[PDB]
Amino acid sequence: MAAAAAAGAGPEMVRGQVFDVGPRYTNLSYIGEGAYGMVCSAYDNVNKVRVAIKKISPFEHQTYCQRTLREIKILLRFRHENIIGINDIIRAPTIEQMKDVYIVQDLMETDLYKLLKTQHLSNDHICYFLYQILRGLKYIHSANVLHRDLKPSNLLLNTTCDLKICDFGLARVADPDGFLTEYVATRWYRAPEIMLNSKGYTKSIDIWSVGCILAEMLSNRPIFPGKHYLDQLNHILGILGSPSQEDLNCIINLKARNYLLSLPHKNKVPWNRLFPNADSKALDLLDKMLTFNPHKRIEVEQALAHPYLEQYYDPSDEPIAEAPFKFDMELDDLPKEKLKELIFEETARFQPGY
């Protein structure tokens, strides 16, 4: 029976979840699952290669719609060796029938979170991985975009040591204006200025995150974990020591400034005691990325030029975006019904026969 033969070719199920990505994508296999999306590898029968596919089911939640739309708009506009690309986007032909969105990407082999569960990296690999993180970040920042959620699990790696940044659902254009109150699986990579509810978040929040990641590559343990922001801030102070007076009155939030001032003194702990086997140039750059004052924190192009990365630094081959993005959306107040229409519009170009 033709119908019986059609149902055999129907949607595959992975770990109990439906993945309706035929006819183009077949032979699905589980990769991973974030807080929002379910990721499988699949065979692309048109381009004849395996790909990664992330399924999101967002339309009942304003916050899921924001993440879906932001990731799609930003990654479709980015093109960089160290940033994951979107190859295709699968969804239903009518807005009425669209309930899931599948984002199709180049397939990577693992992520740095998984890799650090299984092995201690040599200094040479840490150096090259850190270079690539910063090289991709240089491009992101050149577009005037903040990633805002860098962490080991969204640094993808392949079998030839190539690294790509992914997971752009929180990425935003920088602007002087409830930041990062939405749920995330881990807050351990967030800059202290976010925890203190200072107002003017800048590119420096991403550099902090990269400093946390470097620390974790050096010891295979998170450097500033904690149950609550209070606990994380106490771990930051327990290592960096108490902030200076100059650093304090650079904080906009009078309330947070007051609490820190009440805290008992903490002396800075030297990095070589936390990381005794680590390269001293890696610890110098680490120190400059984990500086409390965001105004003093090293910038991405300065970090690329640091002596630790000198064998990879090449400004002639560290490309930037053609134009910095402008903020003309303010989609953080749009209702999820409006967000769904925009997602539908943004994904129309991938529909068969467009």
Added chain:
Amino acid sequence: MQLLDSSNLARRRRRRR
């Protein structure tokens, strides 16, 4: 995963100048 010699970007950096 089993992890500088085979990466394309690393080759460009080795062979600059």
